[model samples]
Target chain A: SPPIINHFHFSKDIKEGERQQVICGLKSGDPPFTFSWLKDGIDIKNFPEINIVDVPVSYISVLVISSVEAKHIGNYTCIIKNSNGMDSYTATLMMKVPPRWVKEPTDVAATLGSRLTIDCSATGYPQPQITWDKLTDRSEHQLPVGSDSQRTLASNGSLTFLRVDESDKGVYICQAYNGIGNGLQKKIHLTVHVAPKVKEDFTVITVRKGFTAHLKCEVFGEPPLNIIWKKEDKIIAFETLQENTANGATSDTLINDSQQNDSGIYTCHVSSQFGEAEGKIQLVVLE
Target chain B: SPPIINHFHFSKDIKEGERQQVICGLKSGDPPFTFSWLKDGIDIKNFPEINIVDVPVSYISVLVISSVEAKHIGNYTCIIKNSNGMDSYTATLMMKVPPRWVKEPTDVAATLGSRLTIDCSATGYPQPQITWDKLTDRSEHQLPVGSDSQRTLASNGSLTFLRVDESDKGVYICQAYNGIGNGLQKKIHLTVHVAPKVKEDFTVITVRKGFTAHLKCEVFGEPPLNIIWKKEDKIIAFETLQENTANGATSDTLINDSQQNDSGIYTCHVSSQFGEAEGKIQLVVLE
Candidate 1:
């Protein structure tokens, strides 16, 4: 025989639970040749997935393993036997599995008199479902008076507290579950502190020609405190003073270039979510 | 003259480095009044930055500070002098300096057998310059073979290494300097590891009759390996074998009903830029 020739190649690594195609052919001959497929020496009979393409002088065959399993991990052979000789080729198939879960949260913290949100996410074979629960402070019966629970599905899932109070402080649990296997869970702790209260303090003022006088209010609280000035229960307006809010604290008012009519009992009210306080001072304006 | 009634509204505190506007007016007046701006207890004219707008008919006066500063921290007043009378109001301006970093990392690490790039970024009044230097080795006097002695300036002022080698692994210092003051320096470490080499492996080939066969080859190299098969003094094509490569050392040849033509001595030769290896197999077809 002029050297029986057969060649076969596999398109991809045969993966478990994956479909793969095997292409086989006999070199240089008429189509009418007997073609058969075998796995590790035995004829692959009763396998409907194997297909043969008929050519007049040569033979071509394809074997498709749909949803492959561990058993399919082995050598597969295709044979063509004719009067000239017998030609055969074989290939080994292997499968690969990917890593399951990879993501976890890093840091989560909050402060008192304010609100905080904790977020968590995960990945897996079957889509993972994430749920949030309170893990720490098991002894607490109900959330603090004004605390509220909110759950939102971001790119991942997250839990938000509308007004995080001291009672809301504790450990939070995030759980991820998939039908393929047991679920995973992570726990995070949060701390809340009571914000300082606004203090009361104000200044007295005097005016003179070609001279200036300054009025100031002193209060104790956060670094940035809000301070206001009022005369006869009505606010004393200014043309240069501006308002600002920082770290949820308020500051007092400052007055300059006082005049005789600028005399009055000035009120400074400082406020924050934590609490509110006020201070007053009598301004004696003299020429 | 009827006593002039002034309407004043306290404005919020102004944050440092921010702009603010305050307005003062006579509650009831026919023509507008002349307005004077004051900071602390001094007139606006004392500070070139303070601006004021006076209205005659409405008795309204406005004061504006283009850019509020820490030095501007104090009481601000808007004084309105009208035909009826003179009225003034006061407010507070406070300056706040947000959290900032005096220095940041200007140099980052890189690894050998790979590429390295470092970035030096900073925010300040005057731009900072980034310079690079190598760390001292145990043999301080010896010059590192792989070190790039030349220092080149990148378009964005960062430093780049075309290709890094084992000798290049060390602490790279990045110094950021501006002529106005002392400069800051940051050190980054780089490490390198050896790469993988070529491997020889076997794959299964097809069978004829009952004899099993295989082909052996080499795989995985920087510059691909060469594979060749020979029978006696003649080179044999891969198609001649029922199976090409097999499970490791074993080669397969198939003989149906014991065929004499299946007898042969086959050899597989594998070579790469690094080295070469060969395997031989003897097959006998028997009935």
Candidate 2:
């Protein structure tokens, strides 16, 4: 007795609306082997979508399907028959739809003193529509100029906020709708910024023995100011000196101890975002 | 009146065996400050090792010594004496010696079949010389034969061997000598072992419908040997495998086709300084 078919193999899982193939091997015997394709339990003769390829000497056969459709999803079998016996193998096919964007926010955030824009996008089998709304602190000053005050829709959905302000510091929502199903929405936050004023002024002073020394400075701004005493033009030298700031004004002083070489110049400087001011003093010491 | 000498500074710690310098400063002074070097209340006017360096207007004077000795370890003074009075400052010098090593090679070891040498290096005011020796063992009968072989020392202080043998292994001593001091010695142990040699032979095994097979034999010895296989009465395969001197092993490879005729006898041959050995295997093929 002669062997009929040797083996058959095919790919397992395939995406819907995709093509696939299966191969079969036959053993050499008295009368050559004949091959055929079958769907379910019926023969696929004259089927326009089915193709069979055969190579001489090599006992192998291939079946190809072009542009598979959902209706074509089922058990596909290949059978080889010879004078010795018959062998058959089956493979399964399936189809699926790809995922699409349902709803998403185009713009995530806006900086202070800057403009803000938000967009909502989505796609679906029946086409999806999108809309926008403020989620929290929905004050009128929050929306930038040229942007719609209420909900608006177009072929493609998106939202814009012009001239964003600090009052608009909250979450805004974007919604997508297809009319036949419920809509989906996403939220984003906005922020604003303003410049800061000078908090305080740096100060340093020095005096010689038996000499008078004065350190004073005034600052008008968001933050108060104070004075510091220093030696060798550096503040680190006066370890015993203390600083105090009260009502945005500062003053510092050192008494005399009378020494010939301890005479030098001192400076008092004030600063703020608006501007800055300074004063200098000189003291003489006697031995 | 002249200015007061508030302080004096030296470049570094004055050692009796090393030179040093000192600087003198007058807080206040008039023009033409006179500078001089002094030792123990006496002015060093013509002293060869003492000289005065002065800076005008700065009221500074420096005293320098060309070379120092034990006698130089004393109170050294610098005097800035102008007609307006005088200022003086002082510094002290001391002497001592540094640390050194007077011993040599503390340990050593050597192995059989290898050359060994040791250095009796030592550190001190004057370098030391090196020598060699052998340690004695009480068990004369247990001592490996040929262990009495003398080691040849090269002019460069290294030991050399024409050929290393197992019996030539033992502890060796290296000694360092200085005429003024006793010699120091160190001893080290050595080991010797036989190397392994390997040979291999392969034969074709059962050849199945889907696979080919082969069999191999590996052998080990001192200097290794040749491996060969015979099919029928003719030498079908052979390899003169090289021996790895360091590791003492050798190997050979044979090939066979999974055919009934490939089934035959295979042999592994090995030889070394110690002895020689061989192994054989029979092969069978199956369809």
Candidate 3:
């Protein structure tokens, strides 16, 4: 009768950088059996991380690794033999390396209404699955940008946008995992260049002849932006307008003495390298 | 700028008995960078099956195996470093051992209507999937005995029959594979005990006076069966019946001289340890 392998456990998916051991035991075999360990098809030579124990009188052979690493990911086989017969069984030493970046997504600048692609590729044994998530102040939500987000995902590892919108200008997080150990995450900033826009508080205003005529214009766009105040198509002096800039928003307000001549339409114009926008307000003075 | 890894490939799923080589190359890195290879966390020591090539003038490192076997399954990492920074990448070597048996099924003898189980377990990477097929004269198509065969399959590695019927006795084949190397196969024979059965060619016969009347009884069951002849519920001598056995069947025919007294019903009875069966025939004599 041949030797029978009762049980063998390599304890797979072992965390990388951790110690682990493998055991091969026989259920039935002739006494005085010869046991040996092999890697792939060759005998395991002397290595710092590997230790082999093959007791002559015992029914089991053990292979231990003080610390497992990526290079240790291979087949471990134990063979037991006697005069009657011999048997060999192999087990794989699978290491959980977690999600490691081969190439992580970086900050990208895309033009409005243009196509864009951001890649986040990783390396792992189980073949990491990549996921894209839009980050916001409230939650890390955004549903992973799949299925209904109008964004296409590459089978390999990337997110594609057919047309980048103003709403797409935000921080995106890419996560890669294979259910082994802790996953990995990376952040990417997406910038979309849009034309300047201007909006005023009131389209029409009525003020007394002696009181001041207050007109406010709100501006939004990427800097360095130019904002101008015009009266009847003539550019007004910057000294007469108050411009407040903070938190990426610009509030340009015009203050002038009320007169009968100021009853004309006043325009607020804002322009950037991309495009320009203007808003008009009509003022009427009553004595 | 930090070093950039252009491409890294370990060439996984290498056959168990073939030669394989892996390469790790850099896309952009400063000159005079240091390149090293690691297994798990420790440096790879000298081994017969492994050969490492690190070219100082080139941007790539190569790792080669003379003959791949079960022991070469593990992780291989390559690291590139310079004054700016460093980058590391790891790849695992996967071996396709085909399916190898841990324990193959053997011939089994099951009692009729009794529960029985036969196991065929195998080991391989990607986790071999076990398939059971009942062998037949035609194609190897028994539809894998799942869902509706009234037989249950264990999640581990075994097939169970809740009730073994005579029809369930036959040769079965078990296959295991993981889409890696070639699959493995084994055969198992199942035997079910059945009661002895008796059948006659004719239930009634007429013969002329003084002529020989030959009546046959067909018997079937497991061997070591006892067959007896009776007339009018009375045991008849063995010398009165001609017995023949072949091909797991027995033919016990009564050759009696036609007479008025031999006109009653003759019974052929067969019995086994499991059960018994009988067939009755009527013989009539005519002037």
Candidate 4:
């Protein structure tokens, strides 16, 4: 006689200090008996708060947690069997607590005219809602939570600016609190000025021995890309191309057909009013 | 759900004039149960005599050979499957036929009063028994299949005589019969002779210019060994031994001290009333 347990489900969600229970119903077999409740996969031991209750004489097994706590959340399985075979029914236990800041923010700055946003995320029993704010300059302009006309807050703790102004380069606050526990606040000192950059922070250029060594880099943005070089003191001369070549190079840098002194980190700095970009590129002389 | 099937087995031997039938039973599984009968590993198809007839019920499957023939023997596999899983049942068609002579007895010769044997082998079903008889003097000299005899027959149809007599040299019959079917028989002619022993084989004798070169060999045990030799198209001369040169041969052959004309094959022949011994050697006159 094989015992088949079909419907295993949770009645509903349980909150802290509330009662939690799981039920395994709609079973079928000849013997119609023998039910055991297990937590995760082990027999319910040491936890006196967990108890088994029956549903009349129908062989339907139910698990009830007398008092809900952090320890009460887990998986519960109801196993039924006799001489022939057995069936296992499983249900997950979920208990909720309030949200708090899992990831906080720091001070920041934004470009004078570019749209900018800062991120803040949090963790909670279920999920947490995040909010953003700006910190005021002095006491008369201060409150427990502060706001500004230029910087708007996102529900997910991101402070956004339709267009960054000079006042956007200040301290911001990220707040998170879901349902029950104490709310969490973090300060974000963020500065945002996305400028022309060598998208490759570091590039490697391998050239065979006796061949002219060439390397190129590219970035995304609108600020003008001017350049600076560190290791060009030996015999320095530059040829600026009107347009970036097919290989994404501005063609503003060259060496005497690559003689020596070229196998080093050549940091070419490109800048604008928004910001500047400085990344190192290495010329690898390979035999 | 896993698929289950009944046993697949052969019911009987496929003899001539008998119908061959095999059934796979008790196959119970998920819906749309497919039934396929295969020979070796392929599906049985329209190769003239093959026909497939399904049963009115699902549990039973039968494969019938309307009239079993030689080609009906093979590996039969039944593949039945549904969405649940597939099950393959295979049984090799092991077939056996009655005794038949794939190999028959061959002619042989033996020496007088010497142990002589003849071979006879055949292919058949089960285990075929072999018997030997003499077809002597244009009459059947059949021996009872029971006990002791002058010539013994082995289970493999090898006929042996402890010592052959003049009367034993005749035609012999080797019969191979398995209890399964009609047996087969074959005849072998036997004779007796004294196989010669040319104690000394043909050899090459080399000599410098103007030196004497000789060659000799012998055979015995029949009427006095008479030996002769020939070089080219001419009769070569010989001289009998008189204990010559310490160990004199049964005879001696001379090549006229190997002159310039002597440079070809020298055939030596020796025979008696029993058999013959002959060989050849090459003699060269070195200058």
Off by over 4 Å in 2: A1-287, B1-123, B139-150, B179-184, B195-287
Q: Tens digit of lDDT per residue, candidate 3, span B1-287? A: 54667556656556656887777788886766877776533355534357788787787788888876544566666777766556667678765555566445655656577667766656555446788888775665565666347688764356888878887877888888879767888776676765566755348877887766777676766543456678888987524332335523554465546678878788877654445678887888888
lDDT at B140 for candidate 4?
Answer: 68
Predicted candidate 2 versus true structure: per-residue lDDT over B124-219, tens digit per residue: 212233455554565422321122355565322334555566655566665545444464555645444343333433434444533334445556
Predicted candidate 4 versus true structure: per-residue lDDT over B1-287, tens digit per residue:
43466876765655645766677654466566666676632347633366767773665567877765444555676666556445556676556767654334555546777666555555444436677766647666665332246677653455678777887776777777867656887665676655556666667777776665666665544332445576765666434331112221255555455566667678777654345677776777777
Q: Judged by DockQ relative to the true structure, which candidate is superior, 3 or 4? A: 3
Candidate 4 lDDT over residue span A150-227, tens digit each = 666553345567777665655666667767667777764545454465677887776765564555556555423344
Off by over 4 Å in 4: A1-287, B1-96, B135-140, B144-151, B179-181, B196-254, B257-287
For residues B1-287, could you state the per-residue lDDT of candidate 1 as single tens digits? 31243544434544444667666756654444566665533457756677677665555667777765444555666655545444455677643332222222321223334444544433222234456667677753332222245334352234556665666666666665645346566565555433223243333333454544444343333222234567685776435332222222222222234245646666666443233456564555445
lDDT (C-alpha) at residue B30 in model 2 = 74
Tell me, by lDDT, which candidate is best: 3
Q: Scoring each candidate complex against the real one, what DockQ results?
A: 0.01, 0.00, 0.01, 0.00
Query: TM-scores for all candidates?
Result: 0.27, 0.22, 0.31, 0.27
Q: Which ten residues in a row are the worst by lDDT in model 2 chain B?
A: B99-108
Q: List TM-scores of chain B, every candidate.
A: 0.36, 0.35, 0.47, 0.45
Cα shift from native, residue B142, model 2 (Å): 18
The positional error of residue A267 in candidate 2, measured at the CA in angstroms, is: 86
* Cα lDDT of model 1 by residue, A174-270, tens digit: 6777564567766655555454443435445545633444545444443223345667889766532323334443333455556666666767665
For candidate 1 chain A, the 10 contiguous residues with the lowest summed lDDT are: A142-151
Classify candidate 2 by CAPRI docking class.
incorrect
